[PDB]
Structure 1
Amino acid sequence: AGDKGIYRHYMQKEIYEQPNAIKNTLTGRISHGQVDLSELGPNADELLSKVEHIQILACGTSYNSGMVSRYWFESLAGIPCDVEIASEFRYRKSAVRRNSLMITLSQSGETADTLAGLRLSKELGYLGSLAICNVPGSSLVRESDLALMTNAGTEIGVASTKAFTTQLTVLLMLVAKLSRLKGLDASIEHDIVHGLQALPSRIEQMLSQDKRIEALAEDFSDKHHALFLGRGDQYPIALEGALKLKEISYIHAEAYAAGELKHGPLALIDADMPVIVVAPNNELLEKLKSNIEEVRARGGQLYVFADQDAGFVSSDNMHIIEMPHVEEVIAPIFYTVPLQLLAYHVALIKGTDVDQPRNLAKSVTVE
């Protein structure tokens, strides 16, 4: 499988390779401050400029990356985007949108549900298909019209880390390139390229503070439940942080849109169910603190990952886990890191099988 070097597990290694991985993914693609996707060929732009809707299919952690990207495609490139679990798409009769581009996200490029949604799509009237993948020569790559490799290097750990952040990096580059094809304000693209060029050092910063996440992991290591909350583009990061905690600690962690906490889940919260919040602004955190106060009688606690610049202050049931300020455009990618490290340190404390969590496999090559 490969040399782990100084890391104890492939996953830890892959988490620490994120900066170099994202660097590698940017290589050849940034030319004079603009996204250069010329690796796609001379007719690529013709197709891309035709796109009026983007459809994304994937499973697991790859669906979570697609979900983040939808907020980018719509808010920044102004393009309608839908993301769907691959198995759900493949078994339903769908209404295909005018001039829709079909994108599949997959680390392995072999996931059966995703490969099937792609095969099916060819007969449904899509403008064409684009594979974002980390494995060259894999089926999803071979069978798509276009492919943008993430170039993260091989990922051996079953719970994906660098493949996810490099996927979001390729996605943001596509959003950039599409904002330009649509003749949208050039600042949209520059903000993205700048967020991207900073990203590697911003994660390297996040990594240097791993010891603080380790301490936090002690408060979750004996818990059997956890609720992860996020709003907008951080909603999917909360999805991804609960998936990672499920995957390698086996804790029953579920994600929720922050605004729906009150429409149900507050009834479950007690001391055995910590609530994590991913990069909330002030207005949202005020609501959440008011919600957690409703459950103080049961020891409800909020754990808030947030920009030190927001000025939030920890209280007895609200713990601010301060992070460096970072560019809004890349914040979803950056806030993933602490959630990967949290899951990893909980797994270490418990002594679970990080690189091969029970009953899971790197890629599900069967439907």
Structure 2
Amino acid sequence: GNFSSFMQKEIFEQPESVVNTMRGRVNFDDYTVNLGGLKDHIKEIQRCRRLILIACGTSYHAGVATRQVLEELTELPVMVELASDFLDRNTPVFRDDVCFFLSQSGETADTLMGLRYCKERGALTVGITNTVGSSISRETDCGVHINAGPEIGVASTKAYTSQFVSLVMFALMMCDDRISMQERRKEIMLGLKRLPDLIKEVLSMDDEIQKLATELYHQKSVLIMGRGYHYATCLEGALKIKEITYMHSEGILAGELKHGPLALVDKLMPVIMIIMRDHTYAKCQNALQQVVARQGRPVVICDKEDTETIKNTKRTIKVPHSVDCLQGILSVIPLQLLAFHLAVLRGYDVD
């Protein structure tokens, strides 16, 4: 290791781990995706009727991050479940379900108990893990190794974005026979090529993320607001800032703001809004104005080329542009960096 913290290293490693996940799998010449661990099951999975993503903590947030593109490209119901809640409810599961179990370690008890429950119902089980030979990796019918390398830190960082990328790769396989989605998977794979270079462009803003931490050093709460593709971003951002900085960070769905949580907004409540260039732009802007009109001052994580938000907002963490279903990868990096720097400022052991 070269850096101070394991977490810190693992964060800056992301332009390399992403490439490792796509290694011997993606091909940018002939637009083919191929996930070896699923090559014996991919046709049976393609005939299934629902996808269930079961996980705890940040591995659950990755499901949330890729729910939408999975629905769009499989045209199947996609259900994302927190493993503890899944087991408490005795969730209905059937033989034509494909159940995914996302777990970095492959040993989290609830996610594994969920695997056994699903297997007993006769569902097709799929592992998205980072630990070869782990319990979740062995006991599932098939699976994918995200290949992000070892993770020794307490907060997941590279594991999250590589869980992300692999689920997007799975989505690209599922829709490979459909004529109408040929262009759509082209633009997604172009973005997967540009991804590591653009992740490095985000790592360039460590300066601005370091000094944003010092302003929020004394603060006790921070509301992270996000829509659609970035609901996961805000949930995951809020979870890091909880876990390692011990500040009350809560992710809030932007569309739910007017239904109650808006009350929390005043001049003294710091807000981080994720307003990016996708189909929900106008609605994210309505959420901004609702916050401003309540006298809040939001640090907006926005697009680099979004002129009417860079000038119109005091603090902006400008992020490079990618295709809508990949932006979640880029826009979460500033928040995992902010979680690290606040932890340092308060004099805590990130590891």
TM-score (norm 2): 0.93
The residue number in structure 1 matching 2:234 is 238
CA distance in 2, matches of 1:260, 1:328: 21
Matched, 1:37 2:66: no
Say which of 83, 95, 119 aligns to 2:116.
Answer: 119
Kept in 2: contact 1:104–1:130 (CA 8 A)? yes
Structure 2 residue runs of 5 or longer lacking an equivalent are none
Other-structure match for 1:159: 155
User: 1:199 and 1:332, CA in 2 relative to 1: closer, same or farther beyond 3 A?
Assistant: same
Q: 1:189 pairs with 182, 185, 191, which one?
A: 185
Look up the match of 2:44. 47
| Pick aligned residue for 1:263 from 251, 259, 263 | 259
**Same amino acid, percent of matched pairs:** 40
> Which stretch of the first structure deviates more once superposed, 218-227 or 161-170?
218-227
Aligned pair count? Answer: 346
Larger CA deviation: 247-256 vs 285-294 = 285-294
Deviation digits for residues 2-58 of structure 1 (CA, Å, limit 9, x no counterpart): xx2x200000000011011011111010143210123433x3222122122100100
2:9 aligned counterpart, secondary structure? helix
Query: Is the 1:179–1:188 Cα contact (8 Å) retained in structure 2?
Result: no
Residue 104 of structure 1 aligns to a residue whose secondary structure is: strand
- Find the partner of 1:85 among 79, 82, 88: 82
Partner amino acid for 1:255? Answer: G
Q: Distance in 1 between matches of 2:178 and 2:89?
A: 32
* 3-state SS in 2 of match to 1:327: coil
Counterparts of 1:3-18 in structure 2 under 5 Å? 4=1, 6-18=2-14
Q: Which amino acid aligns with 2:99?
A: M
Matched, 1:322 2:321: no
Alignment partner of 1:201 is 2:201: no
CA shift for structure 1 position 322: 1.7
- Deviations along 1:195-248, whole A, 9 cap, x unmatched? 112111110111122111111112222111011111111111110000010011
SS of match in other structure, 2:156: coil
Change (3 A) 1:259 1:317: same
Q: Contact 1:57/1:114 (CA < 8 Å) preserved in 2?
A: yes
Contact 1:213 1:342 in 2 (8 A): yes
Q: Separation in 2 of the partners of 1:195 and 1:155?
A: 26
1:334 maps to a residue whose letter is L
Q: How does 1:164-179 map to 2 (within 5 A)?
A: 164-179=160-175
Distance 1:280 1:263 in 2: 22
8 A Cα contact 2:275 2:285, kept in partner: no
Opposite residue 287 of structure 2, the aligned amino acid is L
Q: Does 1:74 align with 2:75?
A: no
1:285 and 1:121 map into 2 onto residues whose CA distance is 37
- How many Å separate the matches in 2 of 1:97 and 1:183? 30
Tell me the amino acid that sits aligned with residue 8 of structure 1.
Answer: S
| Aligned-residue CA RMSD (Å) | 1.8
8 Å contact from structure 2 (residues 229, 324) kept in 1: no
Inter-partner Cα distance in structure 2 for 1:11 and 1:36: 30
Show the counterpart of 1:284: 283
- Within 5 A, what are the aligned runs for 1:135-146? 135-146=131-142
Code of the aligned partner of 1:240 = E
SS of 2:332's partner is helix
Q: Which residue of 2 aligns with 1:304?
A: 300
Distance 2:177 2:140 in 1: 22
Q: Could you say if the C-alpha distance between residues 271 and 347 of structure 1 is closer, same or farther in structure 2, counting changes exceeding 3 Å?
A: farther
Equivalent residue, structure 2, for 1:359: none
- Secondary structure at 1:303's aligned position in 2? strand
Contact 1:56 1:82 (8 Å CA) reproduced = yes
Q: Which of residues 99, 102, 110 in structure 1 aligns to 2:99?
A: 102
Distance apart, 1:335 and its partner CA: 0.7
* Structure-2 change in CA distance of 1:51 and 1:181 (3 Å): farther
Structure 1 stretches lacking a partner, 5+ long: 356-367
Q: CA deviation at 1:184?
A: 4.9
Cα deviation for residue 108 of structure 1 reads: 0.3
Alpha-carbon contact 1:49-1:182 (below 8 Å) kept: no
CA distance in 1: counterparts of 2:293 and 2:112, whole angstroms = 46
Specify the alignment match of 2:16 in structure 1: 20
Q: CA deviation at 1:98?
A: 6.7
